[PDB]
Amino acid sequence: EETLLELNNRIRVRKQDFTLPWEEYGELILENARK
Amino acid sequence: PKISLQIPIKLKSVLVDDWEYVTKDKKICRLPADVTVEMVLNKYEHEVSQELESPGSQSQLSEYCAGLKLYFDKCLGNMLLYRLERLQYDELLKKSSKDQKPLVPIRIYGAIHLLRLISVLPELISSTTMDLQSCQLLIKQTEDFLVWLLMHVDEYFQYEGVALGM
């Protein structure tokens, strides 16, 4: 069991603009349009 | 194969309000935030360590909070910014160069950018070589932090920002 502090330099960082994934947030994004 | 991370629907809704405010209303956060990432994680560790009996339980929480600060400092400028927020960042980066003082994101940004980090943690874990039990602890500690964040949701809280294939 390694903690996040010891995994810090093994979990690669992406270079990208931040997004929300559609499969998890799409229903909320569509409801948000109807406000 | 999915790295399962339960994020309460209220907190997912917080992330979508933020997405609307930035990418639709075109309104950036005022910086520095009043309650930085560092202060959110300091308070969390400070409270939750009072309800843990095991000594190994206290170390793993401290190593979680420390690792999460460290990873926020690495991710923020690489993958946690909407395009609209890059000018703000590039200006902070510019002040850091002129004032000869390094940029420390956990001391500038706030709770919402921390929650952005959490939202992408499953995708980051998924490509990583690590022990399964280390991943399960990572998931457990984050879900614990999340329900503490939800517990304090009122205290802390042209087109871009949606990945249709994800």
Numbering used by the authors:
A (entry chain D): 108 to 142
B (entry chain A): 218 to 374, 393 to 401
Task: Give sentences copied directly from the paper behind this entry.
In Saccharomyces cerevisiae, reduced potassium dependency-3 (Rpd3) resides in two distinct histone deacetylase complexes, termed Rpd3S and Rpd3L1–3. The Rpd3S complex functions to repress transcriptional initiation within the coding region of genes during RNA polymerase II elongation by maintaining hypoacetylation. In this study, we presented the structures of Eaf3MRG bound with Rco1PHD1–SID and H3K4me0 or with a fragment of Eaf7.
To address these unknowns, we identified a region within Eaf7 (aa 108–143) as the Eaf3MRG binding motif using GST pull-down assays and solved the structure of Eaf3MRG bound with Eaf7108–143 at a resolution of 2.40 Å. Eaf7108–143 binds to Eaf3MRG mainly via hydrophobic interactions. α1 of Eaf7108–143 interacts with α3, α5 and α6 of Eaf3MRG mainly via hydrophobic interactions; the linker region of Eaf7 interacts with α3, α4, and α5 of Eaf3MRG via hydrophobic and hydrogen bonding interactions; α2 of Eaf7108–143 packs against α1 of Eaf3MRG. The main chain carbonyl group of Eaf7 Glu131 is hydrogen-bonded to Eaf3 Lys229, which forms an additional polar interaction with the side chain of Glu131. Consistently, mutagenesis and GST pull-down assays showed that L114A, I118A, R121A, D124A, and E131A of Eaf7108–143 slightly reduce the binding to Eaf3MRG, while F125A and L127A of Eaf7108–143 abolish the binding. In addition, R300A/R303E, V233E/W236D, and V233E/T240A of Eaf3MRG disrupt the binding to Eaf7108–143, suggesting that Eaf7108–143 and Rco1SID1–PHD bind to the same site on Eaf3MRG. Furthermore, ITC binding assay showed that SUMO–Eaf7108–143 binds to Eaf3MRG with a KD value of 1.0 μM but displays no binding toward the Eaf3MRG–Rco1PHD1–SID complex. Taken together, the structural analysis and binding data confirm that Eaf7108–143 and Rco1PHD1–SID bind to the same surface of Eaf3MRG. In addition, the solved structures confirm that Eaf7 and Rco1 bind to the same surface on Eaf3MRG, which complements our understanding of how Eaf3 resides in distinct histone modification complexes.
